[PDB]
Amino acid sequence: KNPKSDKFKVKRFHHIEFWCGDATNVARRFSWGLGMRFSAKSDLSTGNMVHASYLLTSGDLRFLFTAPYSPSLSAGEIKPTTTASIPSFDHGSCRSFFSSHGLGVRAVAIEVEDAESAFSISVANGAIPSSPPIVLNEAVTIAEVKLYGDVVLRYVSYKAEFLPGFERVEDASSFPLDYGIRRLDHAVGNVPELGPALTYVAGFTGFHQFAEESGLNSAVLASNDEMVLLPINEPVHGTKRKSQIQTYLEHNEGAGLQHLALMSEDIFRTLREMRKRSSIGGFDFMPSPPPTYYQNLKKRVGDVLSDDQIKECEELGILVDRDDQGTLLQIFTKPLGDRPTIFIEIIQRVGCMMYQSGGCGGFGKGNFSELFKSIEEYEK
Amino acid sequence: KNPKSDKFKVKRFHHIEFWCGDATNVARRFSWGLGMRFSAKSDLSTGNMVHASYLLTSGDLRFLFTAPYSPSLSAGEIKPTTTASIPSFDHGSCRSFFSSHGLGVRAVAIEVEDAESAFSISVANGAIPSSPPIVLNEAVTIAEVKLYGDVVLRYVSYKAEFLPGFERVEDASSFPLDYGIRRLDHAVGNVPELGPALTYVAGFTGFHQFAEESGLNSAVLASNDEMVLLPINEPVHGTKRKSQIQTYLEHNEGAGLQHLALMSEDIFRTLREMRKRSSIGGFDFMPSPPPTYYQNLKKRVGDVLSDDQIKECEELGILVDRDDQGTLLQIFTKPLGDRPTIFIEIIQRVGCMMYQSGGCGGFGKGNFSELFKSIEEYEK
Numbered sequence: 001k002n003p004k005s006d007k008f009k010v011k012r013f014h015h016i017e018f019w020c021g022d023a024t025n026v027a028r029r030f031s032w033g034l035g036m037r038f039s040a041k042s043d044l045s046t047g048n049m050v051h052a053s054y055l056l057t058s059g060d061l062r063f064l065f066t067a068p069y070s071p072s073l074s075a076g077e078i079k080p081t082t083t084a085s086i087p088s089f090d091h092g093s094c095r096s097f098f099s100s101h102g103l104g105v106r107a108v109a110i111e112v113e114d115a116e117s118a119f120s121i122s123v124a125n126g127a128i129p130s131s132p133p134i135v136l137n138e139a140v141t142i143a144e145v146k147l148y149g150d151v152v153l154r155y156v157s158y159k160a161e162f163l164p165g166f167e168r169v170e171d172a173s174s175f176p177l178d179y180g181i182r183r184l185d186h187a188v189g190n191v192p193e194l195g196p197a198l199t200y201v202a203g204f205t206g207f208h209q210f211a212e213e214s215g216l217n218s219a220v221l222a223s224n225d226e227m228v229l230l231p232i233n234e235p236v237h238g239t240k241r242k243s244q245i246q247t248y249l250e251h252n253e254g255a256g257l258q259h260l261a262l263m264s265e266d267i268f269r270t271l272r273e274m275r276k277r278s279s280i281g282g283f284d285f286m287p288s289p290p291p292t293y294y295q296n297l298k299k300r301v302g303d304v305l306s307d308d309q310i311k312e313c314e315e316l317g318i319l320v321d322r323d324d325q326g327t328l329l330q331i332f333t334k335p336l337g338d339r340p341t342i343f344i345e346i347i348q349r350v351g352c353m354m355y356q357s358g359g360c361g362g363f364g365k366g367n368f369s370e371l372f373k374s375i376e377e378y379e380k
Numbered sequence: 381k382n383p384k385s386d387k388f389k390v391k392r393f394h395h396i397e398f399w400c401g402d403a404t405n406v407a408r409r410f411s412w413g414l415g416m417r418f419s420a421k422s423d424l425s426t427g428n429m430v431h432a433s434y435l436l437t438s439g440d441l442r443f444l445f446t447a448p449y450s451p452s453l454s455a456g457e458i459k460p461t462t463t464a465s466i467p468s469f470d471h472g473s474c475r476s477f478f479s480s481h482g483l484g485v486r487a488v489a490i491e492v493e494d495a496e497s498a499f500s501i502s503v504a505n506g507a508i509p510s511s512p513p514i515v516l517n518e519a520v521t522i523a524e525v526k527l528y529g530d531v532v533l534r535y536v537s538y539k540a541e542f543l544p545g546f547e548r549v550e551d552a553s554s555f556p557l558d559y560g561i562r563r564l565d566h567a568v569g570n571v572p573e574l575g576p577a578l579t580y581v582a583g584f585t586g587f588h589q590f591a592e593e594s595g596l597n598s599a600v601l602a603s604n605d606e607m608v609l610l611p612i613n614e615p616v617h618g619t620k621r622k623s624q625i626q627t628y629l630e631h632n633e634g635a636g637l638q639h640l641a642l643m644s645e646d647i648f649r650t651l652r653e654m655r656k657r658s659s660i661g662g663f664d665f666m667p668s669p670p671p672t673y674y675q676n677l678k679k680r681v682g683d684v685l686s687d688d689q690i691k692e693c694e695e696l697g698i699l700v701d702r703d704d705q706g707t708l709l710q711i712f713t714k715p716l717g718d719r720p721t722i723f724i725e726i727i728q729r730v731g732c733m734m735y736q737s738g739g740c741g742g743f744g745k746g747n748f749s750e751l752f753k754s755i756e757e758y759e760k
């Protein structure tokens with residue numbers, strides 16, 4: 001059941017912004033590891049004396065990497081005279097964020113019809129303001145409210161390339177890497193208490209609950225057409241194995257973004273290309289399930305994937321789960337940085353054709369049971 | 381003239397430690413960009429609750445990348461009970477360093493016969509102590525004194541693999557990259573005033589002055605056998621073109637390490653391999669000199685390099701200079717991170733065979749004149 005209760009018109013995920021200590025090195029690592037092209041920049045070479053911001057793109061996916069310069073470069077500036085291309089940026093907030101959380105997502109940005117009204121309505125409905133709406137070059141409006149922890153939900157709206165003050169990256173330095181990643185499917189937060197976090201976010205957006213041993217309780221908030229998907233986890237305490245949500249909260253110094261799920265148009269190509277690079281600058285993947293997991297795959301998805309396509313899942317370590325409407329292929333990276341906090345999920349969904357409807361196949365919660373079962377079966 | 385006045389027995393460069401906000405991403409970038417293998421780690425997986433440290437190696441070159449965890453993980457510890465593998469590490473110092481300077485070198489480590497006596501004699505001779513000698517697992521002694529800015533000179537000595545508490549990296553995750561880099565040739569600091577910096581460092585080490593429009597005055601301090609080379613720059617003000625040393629000091633928030641020069645055993649292979657990766661996660665190089673620079677190369681190094689070997693310098697953008705004793709091939713990367721501060725130089729020296737003596741061919745200061753001359757000749 002979809003009540004379609006969005007309090008303002010939401011379009012799609014627009015971008016994700018990481019707050020870094022050095023944007024250059026994080027961006028170059030991610031680009032090689034994920035096959036994302038350098039698309040735009042705002043930094044000293046573009047007159048930005050405040051922050052270095054580098055945009056990576058793959059399909060519709062936009063990863064932004066931002067780090068502060070010395071405050072001394074911009075000490076004469078005031079907000080009316082700022083050279084920052086992102087007016088919500090603040091040296092002190094960025095340094096506090098990074099020293100507290102390490103590398104992670106500061107902003108989940110969604111595109112809306114009107115960022116001013118989205119901000120106004122959100123705040124009128126309980127959203128904690130973070131940065132008021134600001135009109136960039138009379139062309140783009142940007143505004144921010146608190147989402148969870150120190151993560152903001154960023155509203156972006158266009159009257160009619162990324163943001164004003166960003167320059168398109170020179171073709172010589174913009175190598176057309178592409179491993180098949182095309183868009184952000186969902187972005188997941190970890191919080192100490194799921195209830196109040198759900199009530200807050202659904203309260204100011206009008207997002208609805210998406211119809212869906214693991215150490216977590218979760219729920220998914222969704223926009224009207226269910227293309228903007230914001231799941232939220234809390235830990236389950238007292239268990240035999242320490243909740244990974246709790247471990248996240250400890251090492252992250254509290255709530256924050258847990259994983260980004262990136263849709264691939266060809267998850268086999270993506271995983272082949274990412275795994276080729278795992279030990280030469282890219283990303284590592286979680287240990288593969290035992291082969292009994294794949295011997296059990298014929299029984300439950302044998303009508304969707306061929307024996308060959310299942311074998312290909314086995315060499316790449318891909319997981320498979322199934323809704324009543326679709327099928328889910330997924331795999332998880334190891335954490336993106338020093339701390340056991342943020343990681344990435346690569347995903348491909350099959351089914352639910354009308355275009356494909358959002359969340360087709362679910363989010364893989366059935367893979368907890370299948371892995372536990374598989375584990376003890378490999379032992380046997 | 382070499383007075384051989386070292387006040388304690390110095391061996392070779394041992395390692396360089398970068399202080400980072402996320403050691404993982406910087407290390408993975410550098411590994412791919414420079415062709416250095418992941419050799420050892422000290423982090424959560426090895427019981428270090430204080431800092432994440434990753435060691436990259438190429439030949440004898442050792443790059444260490446370190447970042448702090450949340451202080452909360454180690455809040456119950458005291459120095460006697462520390463789980464830090466590098467006892468000089470301090471969360472507050474590392475965060476202050478990185479927020480002030482951005483990504484850069486914290487420690488220039490040299491191996492000495494006895495790090496305790498090196499520390500004692502240095503301090504008795506004016507060195508500002510940074511971290512007293514500490515004996516690690518009765519096997520390695522480490523001690524630190526201030527070098528310039530917030531950079532320390534780290535003394536390491538072994539009674540008899542990197543440091544205790546570091547683990548050798550698993551072969552599966554340790555890909556044997558190698559682009560020909562073999563050792564650190566020299567490490568260069570920028571300071572506001574050369575005189576007092578020279579007097580201080582030569583004062584506590586006994587290092588001697590190495591017999592050698594650009595915006596800099598410099599001098600090189602050298603150990604007895606001139607394998608440890610520590611040049612120091614100050615800016616020249618008032619010039620037409622703003623001194624790059626001054627620009628460094630402004631963006632770095634003061635004195636610090638300007639460049640690391642890495643010796644290659646095959647600079648053509650190294651540059652081919654690095655340039656292949658410049659736009660896919662590696663390092664960029666400074667704009668190549670005009671072809672008139674290479675048409676002028678026959679006249680001055682035509683007895684050392686063949687027409688072919690000179691042509692190969694032209695496609696790779698390599699610079700060439702010459703002493704009265706040897707010849708210098710060199711090239712410079714763009715800055716390693718967000719700020720126009722630290723960069724890397726790749727170098728190969730030919731001549732001065734006895735083994736090769738240190739600093740053979742000099743450091744390339746004649747390439748300022750050759751570039752200015754070449755520039756106006758390309759205009760003509």
Ligand SMILES: Cc1[nH]n(C)c(=O)c1C(=O)c1ccc2c(c1C)c(=O)n(-c1cccc(Cl)c1)c(=O)n2C
Pocket residue numbers: 186188218219220231232244259261286332345363364365367368371
């Ligand atoms: C469950 C879930 N709900 N929503 C909204 C989602 O997006 C989402 C997923 O994406 C998802 C699905 C299945 C998962 C995992 C995740 C994150 C996961 O992290 N782990 C895991 C892996 C290694 C170590 C540990 Cl402790 C745990 C799993 O075993 N399975 C099976």
Ligand SMILES: Cc1[nH]n(C)c(=O)c1C(=O)c1ccc2c(c1C)c(=O)n(-c1cccc(Cl)c1)c(=O)n2C
Pocket residue numbers: 566568598599600611612624639641666712725743744745747748751
């Ligand atoms: C001079 C020097 N003394 N000592 C101890 C050394 O190690 C060392 C060198 O390594 C060295 C040598 C030649 C150089 C440069 C360097 C760093 C250099 O940075 N630039 C440069 C390049 C781009 C922009 C600007 Cl402004 C300047 C040059 O043009 N030349 C020619």
Ligand SMILES: [Co+2]
Pocket residue numbers: 186188259261345363
């Ligand atoms: Co997910």
Ligand SMILES: [Co+2]
Pocket residue numbers: 566568639641725743
């Ligand atoms: Co040099």
